[PDB]
């Protein structure tokens, strides 16, 4: 995560990333709690909606980036999404980072049926929502594939290994989260390491 071998505070919140999270309300729950996700909840606001810890949420995000950047072949990592809102974001994410992606309905047997064409063997899987993408998660459990997920307050963490707590529901929050994730892996890799803000605008990630 943020802590490194040297001890520098380079990979920390800079009070500017925090402003973006609050602007796109990427810290709002859905008035429902799971026993797994209770640790990421800091308090409850009015109308029953719970909010999410920002330090906890940001810390998990950097850990996920250090795993994606750890692998060397972007085409290996597959990004899937079933909700139509996240369809545009994973496309813009994939092109900048170079990873394979797939939206819409998940064809059963994609990871298990070797005879079929379009048989794929990724090494890391990334999903937008564990509940809607349960089919892909379930298949991943049969072929030794770790997964990374964007999990809301009521999320089932059955086969999830690294969960990023966020607001996976809502057009604005999905686009922001993928933009930040794409930016972080790039500076980790070695490009765009300049302190200047990233040239790419977050509007290209929003569903239209």
Residues that bind another protein (CB under 8 A): 1-8, 10-11, 36, 39, 55, 59, 63, 66-67, 69-73, 75-76, 114-115, 119, 121, 123, 141-146, 156-163, 187-190, 193
115 binds, among another protein, RNA, none (CB under 5 to 8 A by kind): another protein
Rounded to whole angstroms, how far apart are CA atoms 166 and 64? 13
Residue among 81, 98, 4 nearest 90 (CA): 81
DSSP H/E element including 164: strand 162-165
> Is residue 30 close enough to count as binding RNA by CB under 7 A?
no
Interface residue with RNA among 6, 35, 114, 195 (CB under 7 A) is 35
> Is residue 16 close enough to count as binding RNA by CB under 7 A?
no
Interface residue with RNA among 14, 25, 38, 75 (CB under 7 A) is 38
In the complex, the smallest distance separating the C-beta of residue 35 from RNA, rounded to whole angstroms, is 3
Rounded to whole angstroms, how far apart are CA atoms 12 and 3? 9
- Looking at the Cβ atoms of 92 and 160, the one nearer to another protein is 160
In the complex, the smallest distance separating the C-beta of residue 87 from another protein, rounded to whole angstroms, is 26
Q: Count Cα neighbours of 31 within 13 Å in the Cβ-side half-sphere.
A: 4
- Looking at the Cβ atoms of 190 and 199, the one nearer to another protein is 190
Rounded to whole angstroms, how far apart are CA atoms 86 and 90? 6
CB-based contact 76:124 (threshold 8 Å): yes
> Is residue 33 close enough to count as binding RNA by CB under 7 A?
yes
In the complex, the smallest distance separating the C-beta of residue 52 from RNA, rounded to whole angstroms, is 17
The residues, ordered by sequence, that sit 6+ positions from 141 with a Cβ below 8 Å of its Cβ are 159
Angle between helices 54-68 and 171-189 (to 10 degrees): 50
DSSP character at residue 52: E
- Looking at the Cβ atoms of 41 and 171, the one nearer to RNA is 41
123 binds, among another protein, RNA, none (CB under 5 to 8 A by kind): another protein
- Looking at the Cβ atoms of 6 and 16, the one nearer to another protein is 6
Rounded to whole angstroms, how far apart are CA atoms 80 and 58? 22
* Interface with RNA (CB under 7 A): 33-35, 38
């Amino acid at each position: 995560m943020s802590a490194v071998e040297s001890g520098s505070k380079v990979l920390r919140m800079k009070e500017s990333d925090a402003q973006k999270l609050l602007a796109m309300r990427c810290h709002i729950g859905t008035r429902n709690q799971s026993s797994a996700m209770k640790k990421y909840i800091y308090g409850r606001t009015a109308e029953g909606s719970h909010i999410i810890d920002v330090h906890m949420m940001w810390e998990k995000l950097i850990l996920a980036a250090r795993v994606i950047a750890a692998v060397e072949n972007p085409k290996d990592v597959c990004v899937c999404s079933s909700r139509l809102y996240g369809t545009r974001a994973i496309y813009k994410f994939s092109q900048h980072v170079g990873t394979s992606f797939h939206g819409g309905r998940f064809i059963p047997g994609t990871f298990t049926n070797q005879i079929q064409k379009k048989f794929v063997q990724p090494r890391v899987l990334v999903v937008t929502d564990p509940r809607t993408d349960h089919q892909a998660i379930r298949e991943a459990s049969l072929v030794n594939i770790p997964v990374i997920a964007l999990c809301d307050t009521d999320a089932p963490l059955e086969y999830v290994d690294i969960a990023i707590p966020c607001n996976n529901r809502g057009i604005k929050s999905i686009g922001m989260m993928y933009w930040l994730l794409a930016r972080e892996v790039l500076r980790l890799r070695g490009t765009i390491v300049r302190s200047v803000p990233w040239e790419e605008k977050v509007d290209l990630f929003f569903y239209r």
